[PDB]
């Protein structure tokens, strides 16, 4: 399992991501509007990243064979119809400057590799004598996207190309990059060599920058998408996917459970604007999600259009107690599961502990808890973390019981005497 | 899971049980010999219980203790009594009082196993229930039987006089100076046939008997019921597998433990089974051999001890202690290992991947413990990182069994160790000094 | 799996057993009445054994500490209140003589070991200088019966005691012995050493005599009994128990599925006469049972009081086709199972094959079959074995489909052109 | 189970497939080289098919065969065509006709793999459907995609013109002299997303195309979906495991085969996977290594051949044949083994017990066959008795691979053989002479 709140000295990222609200086609004004909202309402709670998802280099996002915006060295650039400030060689620098001025951080998603277009044009590699055709691995592609070919790690110039990307991103004032298409699929092995190359590239780029590569908990046996969305059966399944993830060795990274499909989403997407909506999650479901994401240290990336938040949604995001579980708790662990009743626990740094109790069933259930499950042999005071209220005291000889509505959960703080 | 070292103020029982060496047939001399050994070599390390397993009331037909018309030793109120051929100090009404007195005089504690219910022999004789107005026939549930032993019928908890019967047993045991009672046939023998109301009566009885006394029921994960692995047509006739010196049972215990920890539970220690170590099978018909030294290799023995320690299982030694060698005694007197079983908290399953298994716990002195297990039949490299156990600072790693330093380990590193098949390693992680 | 119709030159036993009808307490007149019925109606079809089940040595069958009938050498004898002809040292000889005169064979069940009573009396062992106390293994008992202790194979005299039993049984004209309490249970290992001793004892006894020792297919996860009875859920489970049995190595014996609880049963039993009844199996269930028992080569032991049979029950027992599957077919095998639809198959010796199709579901289902499942690549004629009727032809390119009522099955003969 | 050696008059396909050596990128010279080898060394033993795997229509961006505005090679009616950089004989309208002609001239047969559906590129271009009044957009089901490959959309079987599209593909393939078509992405990629009506159209199309042609779909048991064993967080992202030279996949195939045989089935051979033998991974990104000799030990290679033989799997060699050594060629030319795969009947699973596995079949010459497998990672003794396979007379036992006599075996005996880990033995049982 993954039982720490810091990995390489960093806590899980907290921010906003353009995908659930704007798909592949977010605009500069949309990004800045979200950054302004975050600066005014959220920043003081630790929300910090403003992240543009994939295909920011595609003017026509949301032919499938339309050209991508690309420099002479085969490096993808922001579409200036969507990012007017990127003109005249500026790229994302003006956007990131604005974000930094708000006290926030700027992130992007990229696809693994080198553009097929670069290979077509045989673009030179910046900082190398080799060209795109000489470094591409043209049999290594993405099972769900046609933008790129892999880079061939056995070729001179291959590392140079990756370095050239992260140097560009550094010049643009990027603070975070997530790389997609690293995971295995039927026809492609996990891209381990490119992972190593990317890691060296970001270390060399000359600017502090967070890298994210890990796909989160693996799938278990429209739904054809691997993406997490506002649908109870996907949220239900995430509970098991997390249990499985935790009992494996390869957990040295945040379990990335997915963007939070909360508030106003579906504005643009690959399948059109028709799906523009408020999250389909009930309030109980939304809290259930927040509780799992918090207690396992998932990054917290808000997926909705922030400026359309209501009081309720803002309140999900501004609970110092919940955020503290996600950012600072340790010994995070799966406690039990029986017949759709689930408990997870963690420990705070000030003598306290946390217990999350979940009813995943479609009918009301009574959830049970004892101090012996979480290592405590003294009387504690129990608090409800979400509403800050005192519940009761609890001794080692006792059991706590709570009836939970379907899909409802409770987050408890266990505080010593 | 179960993450505390104390329940109702007590730690997991440590002791000796007569079953793996002498089966149902231990004698008083054998009990005292083991008690004396424990007193002389083990008491100071926390070993305390001397436990007589089931059928202590069943003399055989060749004994002058045998009445063919009423073959179990039993009092007039339907309470089973010690076989006086095996326990001569029990004669003339003394019961187990002299034996428990001898054990107490060694600074040790005395335990017995009983079978759930009331003897069939009491039902036959229609024995009066002491402190009641009823008889055995009026309280027995004759359709409640134990499929692996004919001694008893269930007691029907819906009947007047049922609680009185159980009260009367625990009064007798208190009289005898008993400190520990384990009830067998108290789990469902066939999964569906549970005994929850009968358990509540036992609990009330022990609580009312006027003597401090530990009650042990059947929380699992041993015995293994309806084992999934290692199945043959002949062995499948045995639905209930008690733990013994066979790798197939030890291997399966690892999965059964993982499953047990994921249950809500009842707040009892997990019982992984008695320790089949040293000289076992002396008079024994249910184990994987005859009169023998344990079939477990040394690696396997440590593997068993490591899992039992890290999950807070009771530690009940099942060998004839007096025949121990230096190796076996050294398994019992390692204070570091015993301290994991007796004192650690936050006891938890960490990972399992292709027969590589990790468990962890935390000490009360700034230290943590990690158990790494190669369950495979060829050598494997086991890995570990600090992020799996909640540590974000550099630590010193020690081999608990041989009390030696291994190396330091930083949060940015992986610990790797090559382990032989069935071999494990118990690590102490202390703060980097 | 077990794919032959002869084991040590013998076919599966066919007969009547006293247990389902009379429990432990059958009488001489009851045994003879069943033998007479068998001689008059069944013998020509191959039904041959007349088998007295356990505790024929107990006068009070149906204290639990009442004495058993026993000779001076610790050998159990027939209760003369139940078996008057056993008087004056005759034992079962007059009964078996009567059975042989009817052209039939006589069998008994015994419990493993030596009587506890013999150990109490320290009875001498016939043909040995040792006594019962010197040969008994008093920690080895039966989990469900208190009559015996095991014999200790490491002791002189132990083999002699077993030999003395089979010599007695030979003198009584016994033709078949089943030994109970050989199988493992929680507290006792499988009794392998005693098995070897018993085998040598029967070889030495001086009379051809069939030994049966094998418990049949093991249990899977009043019902507390291991005995098979007239209850659909037990019959349902037998299908899986047989599948599991077949895929193990230790199959060198008939899979003994249990006595057939057909017709009039429950007359006496351990729990009294109150349960006296006609079989609770429906007609479809009764055929389903017969079909499984036949196709896997289970012994066929009728458990009811034969003299109370109706036309229907007699007809189950006198179908030469079905009996021929049980007695003579080979390559017996599990073909498929999906969602309570099951098929088994076998091959005859005259070019034909057999397919058994079963609906174990509580609702009607359609069962499918193709010639490729059973190794046939030519057109066949299909016959219904039970009613002898012609169904249809079937080519390799086709599928046979049949709707079956719940718990209903069909037995087909596949005959070449 | 599936117990015949002939289905619709044909036996399991034997041939070579370009995937394990060249992935999606085989060239015409590579296909002809393998075809020539097969013709020269293998044809006489029953090897006949030369099969080009998927993406034969996908030139890469560095090729002069590449149009960035329409990157897959495709005709005006939305039918995919050979990449002319890789298949230069395909130029100027020839398609695969010259290649199939060359293959036929060697006395061999020509096969391709296609992806289910219609190219997304056809939908984009709104390509007319040949012999219809409709276009690609009017027949595509754009919500039906393949999760592991972006080439196609599903064809909507509820639409007018859908059958016409499929008809048009099989006319093209008939034109090209194709003898075998395997459709990929035709099973449910995620178990629920099945394609039964689309299958019926494919079947009708191949039947109407005017050329005898074998259709192969996806009957299982390979690829393994949602594998139960050998799971890591990284590898679980791959839901579909194609068979390759890794023991963990071979091991799992044994259980997947047992499960497959217990299904009702559709009356197709079980496909256990292509044979990763000899020189593989030359241009390959989905396998467990790079340019290499097979990672399977010799014992493992025979183990694979034994299971594939005894269950009637197609035999598709996936190595670069021209680089074979004497060992690899000898695996392909053992007439006894091939005769099991091509001629045996009554093919059946016999037992599995603690990683010891037995399968059997019957020959058409009075003989039987038994395959014994040690799937364990240490040596084991495998047993066998005649009663398991329907024989009640004494037999002679032969080792099929090395064509040698072992011993006689009577019905009253057990055959025992010690097998190394992962080692198997294929026995012929003939009548005692």
CB count in 10 Å sphere of residue D16 = 28
Contacts of B92 (CB under 8 A, 6+ apart): none
| D354/B230 Cβ within 8 A | yes
Residue B430 near residue B370, CB atoms below 8 Å: no
Q: Are C151 and C164 in contact (CB under 8 A)?
A: no
d(CA A67, CA A118): 11
**B340 with B367, same domain?**
no
Q: Which of D185, D129, D115, D120 is nearest to D153 (CA)?
A: D120
Helices (H), B44-86: none
Q: What are phi and psi of A183, to 5 degrees?
A: -70, 150
Contact D353 B378 (CB under 8 A): no
Q: What angle do CA D242, D112, D212 make, to 5 degrees?
A: 125
Interchain pair B264, A6: CB under 8 A? no
SS3 D407: strand
Tokens 């013109």, located at residue: D161
Size of interface C-D (CB pairs under 8 A): 75
Which residues lie closer than 8 Å to C225 by C-beta, 6 or more apart? none
The answer to whether B353 contacts A7, with C-beta atoms less than 8 Å apart, is: no
Nearest to B2 by CA among B213, B199, B258: B258
Buried/exposed code over B17-46 (b: 16+ C-beta within 10 A; e: otherwise): bbbbbbbbbbbbebbbebbbbbbeebbebb
Where a domain ends, among C330, C364, C387? Answer: C330
H/E stretch holding C93 reads helix C93-101
8 Å CB contact between D420 and D374: yes
- Chains with ≥3 Cβ pairs under 8 A against C? B, D
The counts of H helices and E strands in chain C are 11, 19
**CB of B352 within 8 Å of any CB in chain A?**
yes
DSSP-derived secondary structure for C152-181 = -TTSTTHHHHHHHHHHHHHHTT--EEEEES
Rounded Cα gap, residues C271 and C224, in angstroms? 13
Q: What gap in Å lies between CA B394 and CA B432, rounded to an integer?
A: 6
Q: Is the dihedral of CA C118, C121, C125, C129 positive or negative?
A: positive
Does residue D221 have a cis bond before it (omega within 30 degrees)? yes
Within 10 angstroms of residue D414's Cβ, the number of other Cβ atoms is 12
**Interface mutation target, options B4, B5, B391, chain A, most CBs of A under 10 Å:** B4
Best of C6, C328, C368, C373 to substitute, by most chain D Cβ atoms within 10 angstroms, is C373
How many pairs of residues across B and C have Cβ atoms under 8 Å apart?
114
- Say if residue D10 is exposed, middle or buried (CB neighbours under 10 Å; 0-12, 13-18, 19+): exposed
Contacts of residue B37, defined as CB under 8 A and 6 or more positions apart, other chains included, come to B321, B322, B324
* Chains in contact with A, where contact requires at least 3 CB pairs less than 8 Å apart: B, D
Tokens of A386: 């979400």
What's chain D's Rg over C-alpha atoms? 23
Give CA–CA dist B69/B84, Å, rounded: 17
Query: Are A2 and B387 a contacting pair at CB < 8 A?
Result: yes
* D378/B378 CB distance under 8 A: yes
Which SS3 state, helix, strand or coil, does residue B133 take? Answer: coil
| Domain housing C408 | 331-417
* Out of B235, B239, B286, closest to residue C188 by CB: B286
Neighbours of B, requiring at least 3 CB pairs below 8 Å, are A, C, D
> From CA B55, how far away is CA B23, in angstroms rounded?
9
Tokens (6 digits) for D265: 């089935």
Same domain, A218 and A322: yes
Q: Which residues of A touch D120 (CB under 8 A)?
A: 64
- The rounded distance, in Å, linking the Cα atoms of A73 and A76 is 9
Left if phi > 0, otherwise alpha if psi is -120 to 50, otherwise beta: which for B104? alpha
Taken as a whole, chain A contains a residue count of 417
The residue assigned the tokens 């198997």 is D424
Among A240, A242, A266, which residue's Cα sits nearest to residue A255?
Answer: A242
- The verdict on a CB contact (< 8 Å) between B189 and C224 is yes
Taking the CA atoms of residue D386, residue D388, residue D392 and residue D398 in that order, the dihedral angle to the nearest 10 degrees is -30
Q: Return the residue matching tokens 């009075």.
A: D366
Q: Measured between alpha carbons, how far is B151 from B139 in angstroms, rounded to an integer? A: 16
Shared-domain flag, residues B367 and B246: no
First-to-last CA distance in chain B?
A: 32
Tell me if the bond preceding B223 is cis, omega within 30° of 0. yes
Cβ contacts of residue D143 below 8 Å, gap of 6+? A222, D154
Q: What angle do CA A65, A70, A75 make, to 5 degrees?
A: 120
Q: What is the side-by-side order of every strand in the sheet holding D180-184?
A: D214-216, D180-184, D109-115, D49-52, D14-17, D315-317
Tokens of D237: 């992202």
Contact B50, B109 (CB under 8 A): yes
Burial class (CB in 10 A: 0-12, 13-18, 19+), D32: middle
Yes or no: say if D195 and D127 are a contact pair by the CB < 8 Å rule.
no
> Hey, what's the torsion of the CAs at D159, D165, D166, D168, to 10 degrees?
150
DSSP string, D128-162: BPTTSS-BHHHHEETT--BTTB-SEEEE-TTSTTH
Is D233 an 8 Å CB contact of chain A? yes
Task: Look at C372 and D4 and tell me if their CB atoms are within 8 Å.
Answer: yes
Backbone angles phi, psi at B104, to 5 degrees: -65, -35
Q: Partners of B429 in the beta sheet?
A: B368, B397
Rounded to whole angstroms, the Cα distance separating D342 from D6 reads: 8
Gyration radius from chain B CA atoms = 23
User: Which has the closest alpha carbon to D319: D12, D13, D15?
Assistant: D15
d(CA D226, CA A221): 7
For residue D389, the distance in angstroms to the closest alpha carbon of chain C comes to 6
Q: Report the relative pairing of strands B356-362 and A277-278 from DSSP bridges.
A: unpaired
Backbone Cα Rg of chain C = 22
Task: Name the 3-class secondary structure at D17.
Answer: strand
Residue keyed to tokens 């130029």: D91
Cβ separation C337–D412 shorter than 8 A: no
Q: Quote the distance between the C-alpha of residue B127 and its chain's center.
A: 32
- The CA–CA distances, whole Å, from D100 to B111, D37, D87, D104, D178 equal 85, 16, 12, 6, 7
Instruction: Give me B325's structure tokens.
Output: 């060698």
Other C-beta atoms closer than 10 Å to the C-beta of D381 total: 10
Half-sphere exposure of residue A150, counting CA atoms within 13 Å on the CB side? Answer: 25
How far apart, in whole angstroms, are the C-alpha atoms of residue D19 and residue A213?
Answer: 29
CA distance A256 to A218: 10
Residues C11 and C157 in one domain: yes
* Residue D124 to residue A63, Cβ atoms within 8 A: yes
**Which one, of D294, D292, D259, D255, lies nearest residue D275 by Cα?**
D294
Q: What share of chain A is helix, strand, coil (3-state, %, to 5)?
A: 30, 25, 45
CA A91 to chain centre: 24
Domain match, C393 and C303 both: no
Look-up: residue for tokens 């309208």? D93
Decide which of B315, B345, B375 is a domain's last residue. B345
Cβ neighbours for B302, distance < 8 A, ≥ 6 positions apart? B331, B401, B423, B424, B426
Query: Is beta strand D109-115 parallel, antiparallel or unpaired with respect to D180-184?
Result: parallel
Report the phi/psi class of residue C160: left, alpha or beta, with left for phi > 0 and alpha for psi in -120 to 50.
alpha
Between CA D53 and CA D114 the distance in angstroms is: 8
CB contact under 8 A, B234 and C140: no
Helix residue spans in D18-160 (DSSP H): 19-22, 28-37, 97-105, 120-125, 136-139
The SS3 assignment for A13 reads coil
* C243 and C381 within one domain: no
The answer to whether residues C84 and C51 belong to one domain is yes
Q: Report the largest interatomic distance among the alpha carbons of chain C, rounded to a whole angstrom.
A: 73
What is the C-alpha to C-alpha distance for residues A60 and D79, in angstroms, rounded to an integer?
A: 27
CA distances from D387 to C20, C324, C330, D349, D350 (A): 31, 18, 10, 14, 11
Complete DSSP assignment for D304-342: HHHHHHHTT--EEE-S-GGG--HHHHHHH--HHHHHHHH
Q: Which two tokens stand for residue C192?
A: 């392998």
C-beta of residue D202 within 8 angstroms of C-beta of residue D183: yes
Between the CA of residue A269 and those of A18, A143, B199, what are the distances in Å? 10, 19, 60
Task: Kindly state the tokens that stand for D238.
Answer: 């791959």
Buried b or exposed e, range D329-344, using 16+ CB within 10 angstroms: eebbebebbbbbbbbb
Same domain, D414 and D341: no
Selection from A386, A391, A389 nearest residue A315 by Cα:
A386
> CA D309, CA D270: separation in Å to the nearest integer?
11
Angle subtended at Cα B47 by Cα B45 and Cα B53, rounded to the nearest 5 degrees: 165
Say if residue C211 is in the same domain as residue C346. no
**Beta pairing partners, D225:** D240
Q: Do B390 and A347 touch (CB under 8 A)?
A: yes
Q: Does A247 touch chain D (CB under 8 A)?
A: no
User: Which of C315, C330, C345 is where one domain is finished?
Assistant: C330
Number of domains in chain C: 2
Beta strand ranges found along A154-296 (DSSP E): 176-180, 210-212, 264-265, 277-278
Looking at the fold, whether D366 and D331 belong to one and the same domain comes out as no
Same domain as D360, residue D280: no
Which of A4, A337, A375 shows the shortest C-beta gap to B4?
Answer: A375
**B44 Cβ contact list (under 8 Å, min separation 6):** none
* Judgement on whether residues A321 and A336 belong to the same structural domain of the protein: no
Q: Based on the number of CB atoms within 10 Å of its own CB, is C201 exposed (0-12), middle (13-18) or buried (19 or more)?
A: buried
Residue in D with minimal Cα distance to C346: D390
- Beta-carbon-side half-sphere exposure of residue B142 (alpha carbons within 13 Å): 11
Looking up residue B121, the CATH number of its domain turns out to be 3.20.20.70
Q: In this structure, are strands C277-278 and C264-265 parallel, antiparallel, or unpaired?
A: antiparallel
Question: Which residues are registered as beta bridge partners of A50?
Answer: A16, A106
Q: Quick one: tokens of A416?
A: 């010593």
CATH number, domain of A396, equals: 2.60.40.1180
DSSP at B91: G
Asked if C334 is an interface residue toward chain D (Cβ–Cβ < 8 A), one would say yes
List the structure tokens of B106.
């060694």
Going by their DSSP bridges, the two strands B14-17 and B49-52 should be labelled as: parallel
Asked if B356 and A249 count as a contact pair (C-beta separation under 8 A), the reply is yes
Give yes or no for a contact between C83 and C69, defined as CB atoms under 8 angstroms apart.
Answer: no
Q: How far is A355 from chain D (nearest CA, A)?
A: 26
The H or E element that residue A290 is part of is helix A283-296
Q: At D110, phi and psi to the nearest 5?
A: -115, 130
Collapsed DSSP state (helix, strand, coil) of residue B362: strand
């Amino acid at each position: 399992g993954m039982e720490v709140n810091r990995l390489s000295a960093l806590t899980p990222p907290m921010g906003w991501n353009s995908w659930d609200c704007y798909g592949a086609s977010v605009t500069e004004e949309e990004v800045l509007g979200n950054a302004e909202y975050m600066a005014n309402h959220l920043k003081k709670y630790g929300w910090e990243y403003i992240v543009v998802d994939i295909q920011w280099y595609e003017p026509t996002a949301n032919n499938p064979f339309a050209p991508l915006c690309m420099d002479e060295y085969g490096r993808l650039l922001p579409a200036t119809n969507r990012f007017p400030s990127a003109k005249n060689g500026a790229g994302f620098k003006p956007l990131s400057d604005a974000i930094h001025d708000l006290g926030l951080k700027f992130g992007i998603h990229i696809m693994r590799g080198i553009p097929r277009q670069a290979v077509y044009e045989n673009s030179p590699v910046l900082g190398s004598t080799k060209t795109a055709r000489e470094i591409a691995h043209t049999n290594s592609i993405c099972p769900w996207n046609t933008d790129m070919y892999g880079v061939d790690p056995t070729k001179e110039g291959a590392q140079s190309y990756y370095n050239s990307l992260f140097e560009l991103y550094a010049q643009w004032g990027v603070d975070f990059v997530k790389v997609d298409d690293i995971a295995a699929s039927r026809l492609y092995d996990t891209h381990l060599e490119e992972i190593k190359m990317i890691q060296r590239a970001i270390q060399a780029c000359g600017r502090p920058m967070v890298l994210s590569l890990s796909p989160g908990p693996a799938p278990i046996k429209w739904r054809i998408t691997d993406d997490f969305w506002d649908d109870w059966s996907l949220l239900y399944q995430m509970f098991e996917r997390c249990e499985v993830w935790e009992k494996h060795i390869g957990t040295g990274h945040w379990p990335d459970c997915g963007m939070l499909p909360l508030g106003h989403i579906g504005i643009r997407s690959v399948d059109g604007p028709g799906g523009d909506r408020w999250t389909r999650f009930t309030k109980d479901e939304q809290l259930t999600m927040m509780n799992l994401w918090a207690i396992c240290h998932s990054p917290l990336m808000f997926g909705g259009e922030l400026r359309d938040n209501d009081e309720w949604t803002l309140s999900l995001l501004t609970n110092e107690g919940i955020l503290s579980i996600n950012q600072k708790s340790v010994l995070n662990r799966f406690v039990y599961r029986e017949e759709d009743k689930v408990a997870w626990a963690a420990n705070g740094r000030n003598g306290e502990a946390y217990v999350a109790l979940f009813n995943l069933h479609d009918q009301q259930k009574t959830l049970q808890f004892r101090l012996d499950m979480v290592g405590i042999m003294e009387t504690v005071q129990l608090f409800n973390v979400w509403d800050r209220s005192f519940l009761q005291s609890l001794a080692p000889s006792e059991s706590f019981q709570i009836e939970l509505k379907p899909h409802q959960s409770m987050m408890l703080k266990l505080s010593p005497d």
